[PDB]
Amino acid sequence: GYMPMS
Amino acid sequence: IGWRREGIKYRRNELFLDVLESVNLLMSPQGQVLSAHVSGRVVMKSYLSGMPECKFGMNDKIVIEXXXXXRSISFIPPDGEFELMRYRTTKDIILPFRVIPLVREVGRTKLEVKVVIKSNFKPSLLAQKIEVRIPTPLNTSGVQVICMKGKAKYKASENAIVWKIKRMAGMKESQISAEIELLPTNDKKKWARPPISMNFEVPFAPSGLKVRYLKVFEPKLNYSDHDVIKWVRYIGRSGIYETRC
Ligand code: NI
Ligand code: NI
Known part of the structure; x- marks a missing residue:
């Protein structure tokens, strides 16, 4: 699913 | 603009x-x-x-x-x-999945089919909506399946065994065994085995x-x-x- 972009 | x-x-x-x-x-x-x-x-x-x-x-x-x-x-x-x-x-x-089929004929009456799927990705990730579709011949009079994971139905109309699996983590292995009961058929007609197909996400x-x-x-x-x-x-x-x- 949506994960924070690093 | x-x-x-x-x-x-x-x-x-x-x-x-x-x-x-x-x-x-x-x-x-x-x-x-x-x-x-x-x-x-x-x-x-x-x-x-x-x-x-x-x-x-x-x-x-x-x-x-x-x-x-x-x-x-x-x-x-x-x-x-x-x-x-x-x-x-x-x-x-x-290639997220390897499908490894195995088909043994038993006289003119049984088809013994074993299918193994292997997930080739990180074990911390999950495939979902997995479906494995095994075609069956038209002179099929019945199917027995065993599968320890998921569920499988023979769908006579579609001439396929459909194996469904909700979740599967990477670097795992699962198999289904099917015994395909065959009707008599015109002898010269020989079965050209269609591919086993997958869906997944x-x-x-x-x-x-x-x-x-x-x-x-x-x-x-x-x-x-x-x-x-x-x-x-x-x-x-x-x-x-x-x-x-
Ligand atoms: Ni949005
Ligand atoms: Ni600032």
């Missing part, structure tokens, strides 16, 4: 990137890749104040089909959801594509890149994913 209006304002400047890929595979019974390619698009859903100059950075696994190309795309996005790019790959593809890009950054520069307005809340997700789905038995 004909794709973006002038005075857009968001307290919460946020964006979402979708890497959406279809992986296609035709494999021989022994495990030779006869054909493999990925089709992908990147969809952006953006809620950014003003007229932001964006720069999308990836990792060059890709053959790309209004922006400005430089591994790196620069663009001012339209507000809301839009398609940033389409692409295709044939090289260095992650994986939370990574089979191409290998990685989003590295999406940088937002908006020179007039008083927010900057570290203010922008940024999300990415990968949805790899099967296209034609067939293994010859």
Whole structure:
């Protein structure tokens, strides 16, 4: 699913 | 600009990137890749104040089909959801599943079929919506199946055994055994075994594509890149994913 972009 | 209006304002400047890929595979019974390619698009859903100059950075696994190309795309996005790019790959593809069929004939009456699927990806990731489709001959009078994981029905109308599995983590193995009861048939008619086909969904890009950054520069307005809340997700789905038995 949506994960924070690093 | 004909794709973006002038005075857009968001307290919460946020964006979402979708890497959406279809992986296609035709494999021989022994495990030779006869054909493999990925089709992908990147969809952006953006809620950014003003007229932001964006720069999308990836990792060059890709053959790309209004922006400005430089591994790196620069663009001012339209507000809301839009398609940033389409692409295709044939090289260095992650095949998420190996299908290993086994078919033994037993007189003119039984077909003994065992199918093993192996997940080839990180064990911390889950495939979902897995379906394994095993064709059965038209003179089929019945099917017995055993499978320790998931559920399987013989669907006579579709002439297939359909094995469904909700979840499967990477680096795992599962099998189904089927006994296909056969009716008498015209002798010269010999069965040409159609491929075993899969469907699945994986939370990574089979191409290998990685989003590295999406940088937002908006020179007039008083927010900057570290203010922008940024999300990415990968949805790899099967296209034609067939293994010859
Ligand atoms: Ni959204
Ligand atoms: Ni600041």
